CSV table of N, CA and C and ligand atoms in Angstrom, one decimal:
chain,number,residue,atom,x,y,z
A,1,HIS,N,0.8,-1.2,0.1
A,1,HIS,CA,0.0,-0.1,0.0
A,1,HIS,C,0.8,1.2,0.0
A,2,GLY,N,0.4,2.4,-0.7
A,2,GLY,CA,1.0,3.6,-0.6
A,2,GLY,C,0.4,4.6,-1.5
A,3,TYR,N,0.9,5.8,-1.6
A,3,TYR,CA,0.3,6.9,-2.2
A,3,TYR,C,1.4,7.9,-2.7
A,4,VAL,N,1.1,8.8,-3.6
A,4,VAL,CA,2.1,9.7,-4.1
A,4,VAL,C,2.0,10.9,-3.2
A,5,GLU,N,2.9,11.1,-2.3
A,5,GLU,CA,3.0,12.2,-1.4
A,5,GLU,C,3.2,13.7,-2.0
A,6,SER,N,4.0,13.6,-3.1
A,6,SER,CA,4.4,14.8,-3.8
A,6,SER,C,4.8,14.5,-5.3
A,7,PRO,N,4.1,15.1,-6.3
A,7,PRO,CA,3.0,16.0,-6.1
A,7,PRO,C,1.7,15.3,-5.5
A,8,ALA,N,1.0,16.0,-4.6
A,8,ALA,CA,-0.1,15.5,-3.9
A,8,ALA,C,-1.2,14.8,-4.8
A,9,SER,N,-1.3,13.6,-4.7
A,9,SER,CA,-2.2,12.9,-5.4
A,9,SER,C,-3.8,13.2,-5.1
A,10,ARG,N,-4.7,12.8,-5.8
A,10,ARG,CA,-6.1,13.1,-5.7
A,10,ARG,C,-6.6,12.4,-4.3
A,11,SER,N,-6.1,11.3,-4.1
A,11,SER,CA,-6.6,10.6,-2.9
A,11,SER,C,-5.9,11.2,-1.6
A,12,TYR,N,-4.7,11.7,-1.8
A,12,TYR,CA,-3.9,12.3,-0.7
A,12,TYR,C,-4.6,13.6,-0.3
A,13,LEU,N,-4.9,14.4,-1.2
A,13,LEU,CA,-5.6,15.7,-1.0
A,13,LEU,C,-7.0,15.5,-0.3
A,14,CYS,N,-7.6,14.3,-0.6
A,14,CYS,CA,-8.8,13.9,0.0
A,14,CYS,C,-8.6,13.7,1.5
A,15,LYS,N,-7.5,13.0,1.8
A,15,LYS,CA,-7.0,12.8,3.1
A,15,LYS,C,-6.8,14.2,3.9
A,16,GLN,N,-6.2,15.1,3.2
A,16,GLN,CA,-5.9,16.4,3.8
A,16,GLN,C,-7.1,17.4,3.9
A,17,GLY,N,-8.2,16.9,3.4
A,17,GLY,CA,-9.4,17.6,3.4
A,17,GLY,C,-9.4,18.7,2.3
A,18,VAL,N,-8.5,18.7,1.4
A,18,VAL,CA,-8.4,19.6,0.3
A,18,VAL,C,-9.5,19.4,-0.7
A,19,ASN,N,-9.6,18.1,-1.1
A,19,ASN,CA,-10.7,17.6,-1.9
A,19,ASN,C,-11.9,17.3,-1.0
A,20,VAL,N,-13.1,17.2,-1.4
A,20,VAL,CA,-14.3,16.8,-0.7
A,20,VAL,C,-15.2,15.8,-1.4
A,21,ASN,N,-15.9,15.1,-0.5
A,21,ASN,CA,-16.8,14.0,-1.0
A,21,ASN,C,-16.1,12.9,-1.7
A,22,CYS,N,-15.0,12.4,-1.1
A,22,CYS,CA,-14.2,11.3,-1.7
A,22,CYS,C,-14.5,10.0,-1.2
A,23,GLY,N,-15.5,9.8,-0.3
A,23,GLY,CA,-15.9,8.5,0.3
A,23,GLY,C,-14.8,8.1,1.4
A,24,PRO,N,-14.8,6.8,1.6
A,24,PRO,CA,-13.9,6.1,2.5
A,24,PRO,C,-12.4,6.3,2.3
A,25,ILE,N,-12.1,6.4,1.0
A,25,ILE,CA,-10.6,6.6,0.6
A,25,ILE,C,-10.0,7.8,1.3
A,26,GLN,N,-10.8,8.7,1.8
A,26,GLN,CA,-10.3,9.9,2.4
A,26,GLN,C,-9.5,9.4,3.7
A,27,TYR,N,-9.8,8.2,4.2
A,27,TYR,CA,-9.2,7.7,5.5
A,27,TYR,C,-8.0,6.8,5.1
A,28,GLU,N,-7.9,6.4,3.9
A,28,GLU,CA,-6.8,5.6,3.4
A,28,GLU,C,-6.3,5.8,2.0
A,29,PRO,N,-5.6,7.0,1.8
A,29,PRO,CA,-5.1,7.3,0.4
A,29,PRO,C,-4.1,6.2,-0.1
A,30,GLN,N,-3.5,5.5,0.8
A,30,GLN,CA,-2.5,4.5,0.4
A,30,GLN,C,-3.2,3.2,-0.2
A,31,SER,N,-4.5,3.1,-0.2
A,31,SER,CA,-5.2,1.8,-0.6
A,31,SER,C,-5.9,1.8,-1.9
A,32,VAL,N,-5.5,2.6,-2.9
A,32,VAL,CA,-6.2,2.5,-4.2
A,32,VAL,C,-5.5,1.4,-5.0
A,33,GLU,N,-5.9,0.1,-4.7
A,33,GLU,CA,-5.4,-1.0,-5.4
A,33,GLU,C,-6.4,-1.7,-6.3
A,34,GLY,N,-5.9,-2.0,-7.4
A,34,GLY,CA,-6.8,-2.8,-8.4
A,34,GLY,C,-5.9,-3.8,-9.1
A,35,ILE,N,-6.4,-4.5,-10.1
A,35,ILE,CA,-5.7,-5.5,-10.9
A,35,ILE,C,-4.6,-4.7,-11.7
A,36,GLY,N,-3.4,-5.4,-11.8
A,36,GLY,CA,-2.3,-4.8,-12.4
A,36,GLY,C,-2.2,-5.1,-13.9
A,37,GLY,N,-1.0,-4.9,-14.4
A,37,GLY,CA,-0.8,-5.2,-15.9
A,37,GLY,C,-1.3,-4.1,-16.7
A,38,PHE,N,-1.4,-2.9,-16.2
A,38,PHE,CA,-1.9,-1.8,-16.8
A,38,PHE,C,-0.8,-1.3,-17.9
A,39,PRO,N,-1.2,-1.0,-19.1
A,39,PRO,CA,-2.6,-0.7,-19.6
A,39,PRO,C,-3.2,-1.9,-20.2
A,40,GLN,N,-2.5,-2.9,-20.5
A,40,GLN,CA,-3.1,-4.1,-21.1
A,40,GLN,C,-4.2,-4.8,-20.2
A,41,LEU,N,-4.0,-5.0,-19.1
A,41,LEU,CA,-4.9,-5.4,-18.0
A,41,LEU,C,-5.3,-4.2,-17.2
A,42,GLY,N,-5.8,-4.5,-16.0
A,42,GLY,CA,-6.2,-3.5,-14.9
A,42,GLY,C,-7.6,-3.2,-14.9
A,43,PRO,N,-7.9,-2.1,-14.1
A,43,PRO,CA,-9.3,-1.6,-14.0
A,43,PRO,C,-10.0,-1.2,-15.3
A,44,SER,N,-11.2,-1.4,-15.4
A,44,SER,CA,-11.9,-1.1,-16.7
A,44,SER,C,-11.9,0.5,-17.0
A,45,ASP,N,-12.0,0.9,-18.3
A,45,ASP,CA,-12.1,2.3,-18.5
A,45,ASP,C,-13.3,3.0,-17.7
A,46,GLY,N,-12.9,4.2,-17.3
A,46,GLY,CA,-13.8,4.9,-16.4
A,46,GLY,C,-13.7,4.5,-15.0
A,47,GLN,N,-12.8,3.6,-14.7
A,47,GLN,CA,-12.6,3.1,-13.3
A,47,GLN,C,-11.2,3.1,-13.0
A,48,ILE,N,-10.4,3.7,-13.7
A,48,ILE,CA,-9.0,3.8,-13.5
A,48,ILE,C,-8.5,4.6,-12.2
A,49,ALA,N,-9.2,5.6,-12.0
A,49,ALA,CA,-8.9,6.5,-10.8
A,49,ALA,C,-9.2,5.8,-9.5
A,50,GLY,N,-10.2,5.0,-9.4
A,50,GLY,CA,-10.4,4.2,-8.3
A,50,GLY,C,-10.0,2.8,-8.3
A,51,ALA,N,-9.4,2.4,-9.5
A,51,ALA,CA,-8.9,0.9,-9.6
A,51,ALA,C,-10.0,0.0,-9.4
A,52,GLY,N,-11.2,0.1,-9.7
A,52,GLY,CA,-12.3,-0.8,-9.6
A,52,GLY,C,-12.9,-0.8,-8.2
A,53,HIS,N,-12.3,-0.1,-7.2
A,53,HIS,CA,-13.0,0.1,-6.0
A,53,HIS,C,-13.0,1.6,-5.9
A,54,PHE,N,-13.5,2.2,-4.8
A,54,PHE,CA,-13.7,3.6,-4.5
A,54,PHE,C,-14.1,4.4,-5.7
A,55,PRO,N,-15.3,4.2,-6.2
A,55,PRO,CA,-15.9,4.9,-7.4
A,55,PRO,C,-16.0,6.3,-7.3
A,56,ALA,N,-15.9,7.0,-6.1
A,56,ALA,CA,-16.1,8.5,-6.0
A,56,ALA,C,-14.9,9.1,-6.7
A,57,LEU,N,-13.8,8.5,-6.7
A,57,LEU,CA,-12.6,9.2,-7.4
A,57,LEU,C,-12.7,9.1,-8.9
A,58,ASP,N,-13.7,8.4,-9.5
A,58,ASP,CA,-13.7,8.3,-10.9
A,58,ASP,C,-14.6,9.4,-11.5
A,59,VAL,N,-15.2,10.2,-10.7
A,59,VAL,CA,-15.9,11.3,-11.3
A,59,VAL,C,-15.0,12.3,-11.7
A,60,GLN,N,-15.3,12.9,-13.0
A,60,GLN,CA,-14.3,13.7,-13.7
A,60,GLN,C,-15.0,15.0,-14.4
A,61,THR,N,-14.7,16.1,-13.8
A,61,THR,CA,-15.1,17.4,-14.5
A,61,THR,C,-14.0,18.4,-14.2
A,62,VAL,N,-14.2,19.5,-14.9
A,62,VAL,CA,-13.1,20.6,-14.8
A,62,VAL,C,-12.9,21.1,-13.4
A,63,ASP,N,-14.0,21.2,-12.7
A,63,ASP,CA,-14.0,21.8,-11.4
A,63,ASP,C,-14.2,20.9,-10.1
A,64,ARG,N,-14.3,19.6,-10.4
A,64,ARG,CA,-14.5,18.6,-9.4
A,64,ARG,C,-13.3,18.5,-8.4
A,65,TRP,N,-12.1,18.6,-8.9
A,65,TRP,CA,-10.8,18.3,-8.0
A,65,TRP,C,-10.0,19.6,-8.0
A,66,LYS,N,-9.3,19.6,-6.9
A,66,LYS,CA,-8.3,20.8,-6.7
A,66,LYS,C,-7.0,20.3,-7.3
A,67,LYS,N,-6.4,21.3,-8.0
A,67,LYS,CA,-5.2,20.9,-8.8
A,67,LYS,C,-3.9,21.3,-8.2
A,68,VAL,N,-2.9,20.5,-8.4
A,68,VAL,CA,-1.5,20.8,-8.0
A,68,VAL,C,-0.8,21.5,-9.1
A,69,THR,N,-0.1,22.6,-8.9
A,69,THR,CA,0.7,23.3,-10.0
A,69,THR,C,2.0,22.8,-10.2
A,70,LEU,N,2.3,22.4,-11.5
A,70,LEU,CA,3.6,21.8,-11.8
A,70,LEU,C,4.2,22.4,-13.1
A,71,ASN,N,5.6,22.5,-13.1
A,71,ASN,CA,6.2,22.9,-14.4
A,71,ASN,C,6.4,21.7,-15.2
A,72,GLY,N,6.5,21.8,-16.6
A,72,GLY,CA,6.9,20.7,-17.3
A,72,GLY,C,8.4,20.4,-17.2
A,73,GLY,N,9.0,19.4,-17.6
A,73,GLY,CA,10.4,19.2,-17.4
A,73,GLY,C,10.6,18.4,-16.3
A,74,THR,N,11.9,18.5,-15.6
A,74,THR,CA,12.2,17.7,-14.5
A,74,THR,C,11.4,18.0,-13.3
A,75,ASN,N,10.9,16.9,-12.7
A,75,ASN,CA,10.0,16.9,-11.5
A,75,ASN,C,10.4,15.8,-10.7
A,76,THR,N,10.3,16.0,-9.3
A,76,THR,CA,10.6,14.9,-8.3
A,76,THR,C,9.2,14.3,-7.9
A,77,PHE,N,9.2,13.0,-8.0
A,77,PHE,CA,8.0,12.3,-7.6
A,77,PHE,C,8.2,11.4,-6.3
A,78,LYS,N,7.6,11.7,-5.3
A,78,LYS,CA,7.9,11.2,-3.9
A,78,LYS,C,6.5,10.3,-3.6
A,79,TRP,N,6.8,9.0,-3.3
A,79,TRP,CA,5.8,8.1,-2.8
A,79,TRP,C,5.8,8.0,-1.3
A,80,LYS,N,4.7,7.7,-0.7
A,80,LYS,CA,4.7,7.2,0.6
A,80,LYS,C,4.1,5.8,0.7
A,81,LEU,N,4.9,4.9,1.2
A,81,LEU,CA,4.4,3.4,1.2
A,81,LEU,C,4.2,3.1,2.7
A,82,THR,N,2.9,2.8,2.9
A,82,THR,CA,2.5,2.4,4.3
A,82,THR,C,2.8,0.9,4.4
A,83,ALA,N,2.9,0.1,3.3
A,83,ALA,CA,3.4,-1.2,3.4
A,83,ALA,C,4.2,-1.5,2.0
A,84,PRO,N,5.5,-1.7,2.2
A,84,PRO,CA,6.5,-2.0,1.1
A,84,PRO,C,6.1,-3.4,0.5
A,85,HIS,N,6.1,-3.5,-0.9
A,85,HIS,CA,6.0,-4.8,-1.4
A,85,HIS,C,6.9,-5.0,-2.6
A,86,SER,N,7.3,-6.3,-2.9
A,86,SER,CA,8.2,-6.6,-4.0
A,86,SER,C,7.6,-5.9,-5.2
A,87,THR,N,8.5,-5.1,-5.9
A,87,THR,CA,8.0,-4.2,-6.9
A,87,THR,C,8.4,-4.6,-8.3
A,88,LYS,N,7.5,-4.8,-9.2
A,88,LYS,CA,7.7,-4.9,-10.6
A,88,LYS,C,8.3,-3.6,-11.2
A,89,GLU,N,7.5,-2.6,-11.3
A,89,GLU,CA,8.0,-1.3,-11.8
A,89,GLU,C,7.1,-0.2,-11.4
A,90,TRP,N,7.7,1.0,-11.6
A,90,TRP,CA,7.0,2.2,-11.4
A,90,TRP,C,6.7,2.9,-12.8
A,91,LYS,N,5.4,3.4,-13.0
A,91,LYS,CA,5.2,4.1,-14.2
A,91,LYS,C,4.4,5.4,-13.9
A,92,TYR,N,4.6,6.3,-14.9
A,92,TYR,CA,4.0,7.6,-14.9
A,92,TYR,C,3.3,8.0,-16.2
A,93,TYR,N,2.1,8.1,-16.3
A,93,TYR,CA,1.4,8.4,-17.5
A,93,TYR,C,0.8,9.8,-17.4
A,94,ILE,N,0.5,10.4,-18.6
A,94,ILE,CA,-0.1,11.7,-18.7
A,94,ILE,C,-1.2,11.8,-19.7
A,95,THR,N,-2.3,12.5,-19.5
A,95,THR,CA,-3.4,12.7,-20.4
A,95,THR,C,-2.9,13.2,-21.7
A,96,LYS,N,-3.5,12.9,-22.8
A,96,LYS,CA,-3.2,13.4,-24.1
A,96,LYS,C,-3.5,15.0,-24.2
A,97,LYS,N,-2.9,15.6,-25.2
A,97,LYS,CA,-2.9,17.1,-25.3
A,97,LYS,C,-4.4,17.6,-25.3
A,98,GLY,N,-5.3,16.9,-26.1
A,98,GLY,CA,-6.6,17.4,-26.3
A,98,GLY,C,-7.6,16.6,-25.6
A,99,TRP,N,-7.3,16.1,-24.3
A,99,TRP,CA,-8.2,15.1,-23.6
A,99,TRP,C,-9.4,15.9,-23.1
A,100,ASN,N,-10.4,15.1,-22.8
A,100,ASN,CA,-11.7,15.6,-22.3
A,100,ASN,C,-11.8,15.6,-20.9
A,101,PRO,N,-11.6,16.7,-20.2
A,101,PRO,CA,-11.6,16.7,-18.8
A,101,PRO,C,-13.0,16.6,-18.1
A,102,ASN,N,-14.0,16.6,-19.0
A,102,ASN,CA,-15.4,16.5,-18.6
A,102,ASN,C,-16.0,15.2,-18.8
A,103,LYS,N,-15.1,14.1,-18.9
A,103,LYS,CA,-15.5,12.8,-19.2
A,103,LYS,C,-14.5,11.8,-18.4
A,104,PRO,N,-15.0,10.7,-17.9
A,104,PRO,CA,-14.4,9.8,-17.1
A,104,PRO,C,-13.1,9.2,-17.8
A,105,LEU,N,-12.1,9.0,-17.0
A,105,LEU,CA,-10.7,8.7,-17.5
A,105,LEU,C,-10.8,7.3,-18.2
A,106,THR,N,-10.3,7.3,-19.5
A,106,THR,CA,-10.2,6.0,-20.2
A,106,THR,C,-8.8,5.9,-20.8
A,107,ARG,N,-8.4,4.7,-21.1
A,107,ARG,CA,-7.0,4.4,-21.6
A,107,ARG,C,-6.8,5.3,-22.9
A,108,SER,N,-7.8,5.5,-23.7
A,108,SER,CA,-7.8,6.2,-24.9
A,108,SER,C,-7.3,7.7,-24.7
A,109,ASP,N,-7.7,8.1,-23.4
A,109,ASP,CA,-7.4,9.5,-23.0
A,109,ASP,C,-5.9,9.7,-22.5
A,110,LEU,N,-5.2,8.6,-22.5
A,110,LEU,CA,-3.8,8.6,-22.0
A,110,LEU,C,-2.7,8.3,-23.1
A,111,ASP,N,-1.6,9.1,-23.0
A,111,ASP,CA,-0.4,8.7,-23.7
A,111,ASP,C,0.1,7.4,-23.0
A,112,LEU,N,-0.2,6.2,-23.7
A,112,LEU,CA,-0.1,4.8,-23.1
A,112,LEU,C,1.4,4.5,-23.0
A,113,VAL,N,2.3,5.3,-23.6
A,113,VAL,CA,3.7,5.2,-23.3
A,113,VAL,C,4.0,6.2,-22.3
A,114,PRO,N,4.4,5.7,-21.0
A,114,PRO,CA,4.6,6.5,-19.8
A,114,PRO,C,5.9,7.4,-20.0
A,115,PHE,N,5.7,8.6,-19.5
A,115,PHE,CA,6.9,9.5,-19.7
A,115,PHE,C,8.0,9.2,-18.7
A,116,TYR,N,7.7,8.4,-17.8
A,116,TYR,CA,8.8,7.8,-16.9
A,116,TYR,C,8.4,6.4,-16.5
A,117,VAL,N,9.3,5.4,-16.6
A,117,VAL,CA,9.1,4.1,-16.1
A,117,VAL,C,10.5,3.6,-15.6
A,118,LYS,N,10.4,3.0,-14.3
A,118,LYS,CA,11.5,2.3,-13.7
A,118,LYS,C,11.2,1.0,-13.2
A,119,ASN,N,12.1,0.0,-13.6
A,119,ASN,CA,11.9,-1.4,-13.1
A,119,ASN,C,12.8,-1.7,-11.9
A,120,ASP,N,12.2,-2.3,-10.9
A,120,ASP,CA,12.9,-2.7,-9.7
A,120,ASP,C,13.2,-4.1,-9.7
A,121,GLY,N,12.8,-4.9,-10.7
A,121,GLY,CA,13.2,-6.4,-10.8
A,121,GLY,C,12.8,-7.2,-9.7
A,122,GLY,N,11.7,-6.8,-9.0
A,122,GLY,CA,11.2,-7.5,-7.9
A,122,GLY,C,11.6,-7.1,-6.5
A,123,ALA,N,12.5,-6.2,-6.5
A,123,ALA,CA,13.1,-5.7,-5.2
A,123,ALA,C,12.1,-5.0,-4.4
A,124,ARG,N,12.4,-5.1,-3.0
A,124,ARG,CA,11.5,-4.4,-2.0
A,124,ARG,C,12.1,-3.1,-1.6
A,125,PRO,N,11.3,-2.1,-1.7
A,125,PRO,CA,11.7,-0.8,-1.4
A,125,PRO,C,11.6,-0.3,0.0
A,126,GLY,N,12.1,0.9,0.3
A,126,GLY,CA,11.9,1.6,1.7
A,126,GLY,C,10.5,2.2,1.8
A,127,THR,N,10.3,2.9,2.9
A,127,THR,CA,9.0,3.5,3.1
A,127,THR,C,8.8,4.8,2.2
A,128,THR,N,10.1,5.3,1.8
A,128,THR,CA,10.1,6.5,0.9
A,128,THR,C,10.7,6.1,-0.4
A,129,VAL,N,10.0,6.3,-1.4
A,129,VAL,CA,10.5,6.1,-2.8
A,129,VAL,C,10.5,7.5,-3.6
A,130,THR,N,11.7,7.7,-4.3
A,130,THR,CA,11.7,9.0,-5.0
A,130,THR,C,12.2,8.7,-6.4
A,131,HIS,N,11.6,9.5,-7.5
A,131,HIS,CA,11.9,9.3,-8.8
A,131,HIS,C,12.0,10.7,-9.4
A,132,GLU,N,13.0,10.9,-10.3
A,132,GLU,CA,13.2,12.1,-11.2
A,132,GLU,C,12.7,11.9,-12.5
A,133,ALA,N,11.5,12.4,-12.8
A,133,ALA,CA,11.0,12.3,-14.1
A,133,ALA,C,10.9,13.5,-14.9
A,134,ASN,N,10.8,13.5,-16.3
A,134,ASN,CA,10.7,14.6,-17.0
A,134,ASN,C,9.2,14.7,-17.6
A,135,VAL,N,8.5,15.6,-17.0
A,135,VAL,CA,7.1,15.8,-17.5
A,135,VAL,C,7.0,16.4,-18.9
A,136,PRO,N,6.3,15.9,-19.9
A,136,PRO,CA,6.2,16.5,-21.2
A,136,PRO,C,6.0,17.9,-21.2
A,137,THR,N,6.7,18.7,-22.2
A,137,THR,CA,6.6,20.1,-22.2
A,137,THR,C,5.8,20.6,-23.3
A,138,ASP,N,4.9,19.8,-23.9
A,138,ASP,CA,4.2,20.2,-24.9
A,138,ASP,C,2.6,20.2,-24.5
A,139,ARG,N,2.4,20.2,-23.3
A,139,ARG,CA,1.0,20.2,-22.8
A,139,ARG,C,0.8,21.3,-21.8
A,140,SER,N,-0.4,21.8,-21.6
A,140,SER,CA,-0.7,23.0,-20.8
A,140,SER,C,-2.2,22.8,-20.1
A,141,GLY,N,-2.2,23.5,-19.0
A,141,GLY,CA,-3.6,23.5,-18.3
A,141,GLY,C,-3.9,22.3,-17.5
A,142,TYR,N,-5.2,22.0,-17.3
A,142,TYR,CA,-5.6,20.9,-16.7
A,142,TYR,C,-5.3,19.5,-17.2
A,143,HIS,N,-4.4,18.7,-16.6
A,143,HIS,CA,-4.1,17.4,-17.2
A,143,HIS,C,-4.1,16.5,-15.9
A,144,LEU,N,-4.2,15.1,-16.2
A,144,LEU,CA,-4.0,14.2,-15.2
A,144,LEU,C,-2.7,13.4,-15.4
A,145,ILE,N,-2.0,13.2,-14.3
A,145,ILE,CA,-0.8,12.3,-14.2
A,145,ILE,C,-1.3,11.0,-13.5
A,146,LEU,N,-1.1,9.9,-14.0
A,146,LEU,CA,-1.5,8.6,-13.4
A,146,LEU,C,-0.2,7.9,-13.1
A,147,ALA,N,0.0,7.8,-11.8
A,147,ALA,CA,1.2,7.1,-11.2
A,147,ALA,C,0.7,5.6,-10.8
A,148,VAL,N,1.5,4.7,-11.4
A,148,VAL,CA,1.1,3.3,-11.2
A,148,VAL,C,2.3,2.5,-10.5
A,149,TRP,N,2.0,1.7,-9.4
A,149,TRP,CA,2.9,1.0,-8.8
A,149,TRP,C,2.5,-0.5,-8.9
A,150,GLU,N,3.3,-1.2,-9.7
A,150,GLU,CA,3.1,-2.5,-10.0
A,150,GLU,C,3.7,-3.6,-9.1
A,151,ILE,N,2.8,-4.3,-8.3
A,151,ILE,CA,3.3,-5.3,-7.3
A,151,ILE,C,3.8,-6.5,-8.0
A,152,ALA,N,5.0,-7.1,-7.8
A,152,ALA,CA,5.3,-8.3,-8.4
A,152,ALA,C,4.7,-9.5,-8.0
A,153,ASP,N,4.4,-9.8,-6.8
A,153,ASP,CA,3.9,-11.1,-6.3
A,153,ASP,C,2.4,-11.2,-6.7
A,154,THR,N,1.6,-10.2,-6.2
A,154,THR,CA,0.2,-10.2,-6.5
A,154,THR,C,0.1,-9.5,-8.0
A,155,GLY,N,-0.9,-10.0,-8.7
A,155,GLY,CA,-1.2,-9.6,-10.0
A,155,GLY,C,-1.9,-8.1,-10.0
A,156,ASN,N,-1.6,-7.4,-8.9
A,156,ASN,CA,-2.2,-6.1,-8.6
A,156,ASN,C,-1.3,-4.9,-8.8
A,157,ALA,N,-1.9,-3.6,-8.9
A,157,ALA,CA,-1.1,-2.5,-9.0
A,157,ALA,C,-1.8,-1.3,-8.2
A,158,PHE,N,-1.1,-0.4,-7.8
A,158,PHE,CA,-1.7,0.7,-7.1
A,158,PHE,C,-1.7,2.0,-8.0
A,159,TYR,N,-2.9,2.6,-8.1
A,159,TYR,CA,-3.2,3.6,-9.0
A,159,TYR,C,-3.3,5.0,-8.4
A,160,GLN,N,-2.5,6.0,-8.7
A,160,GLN,CA,-2.5,7.2,-8.1
A,160,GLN,C,-2.7,8.3,-9.1
A,161,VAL,N,-4.0,8.8,-9.2
A,161,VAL,CA,-4.2,10.0,-10.2
A,161,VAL,C,-3.9,11.2,-9.5
A,162,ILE,N,-3.1,12.1,-10.1
A,162,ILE,CA,-2.8,13.4,-9.7
A,162,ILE,C,-3.4,14.5,-10.6
A,163,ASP,N,-4.3,15.4,-10.0
A,163,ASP,CA,-4.8,16.5,-10.7
A,163,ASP,C,-3.9,17.6,-10.9
A,164,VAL,N,-3.3,17.9,-12.0
A,164,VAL,CA,-2.2,18.9,-12.2
A,164,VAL,C,-2.7,20.2,-12.9
A,165,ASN,N,-2.2,21.3,-12.5
A,165,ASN,CA,-2.2,22.5,-13.3
A,165,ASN,C,-0.9,22.7,-14.0
A,166,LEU,N,-0.8,22.4,-15.3
A,166,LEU,CA,0.4,22.3,-15.9
A,166,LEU,C,0.9,23.6,-16.6
A,167,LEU,N,2.2,23.9,-16.5
A,167,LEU,CA,2.8,25.1,-17.1
A,167,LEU,C,4.0,24.7,-17.9
A,168,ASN,N,3.7,25.0,-19.2
A,168,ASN,CA,4.8,24.8,-20.3
A,168,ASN,C,4.9,26.0,-21.2
A,169,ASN,N,5.8,27.0,-20.8
A,169,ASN,CA,6.0,28.2,-21.6
A,169,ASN,C,7.3,28.2,-22.2
B,1,LIG,CU1,-0.1,-3.0,0.2
């Protein structure tokens, strides 16, 4: 179990009371677990944000969620893991340039080639995991970053949607 501490994920901000009406997940941002093998397998379209559970996170409009402001280019991504697991890989996806923010998240709305991916070869991590990734510099405004944590032993993965206000000038 775990969540993206920085930049603050949607479930994390629910916990901090920044987002509202998030359901039970507000008390466990670390627990957005669903089937792994994304994007080939995993939670169904329109159910990515909640990973098949916690449907409240799957609601998608322009004003529904509070946005984290980020620059394109190099960014530090810090997870917090409440339980470390043998790790297949870490992946970070971003919405396409002309994606529909008033529509539930679907694989078709994502650049299915992650802008950052790290393989851990089954290794077990610490309670703090840090990644330096290059956020695409060709997008602007409201976008979603989908952070995925693939667990090696269980065919499961943890899905962390981040609502971002992107800046690329
Ligand atoms: Cu866990």
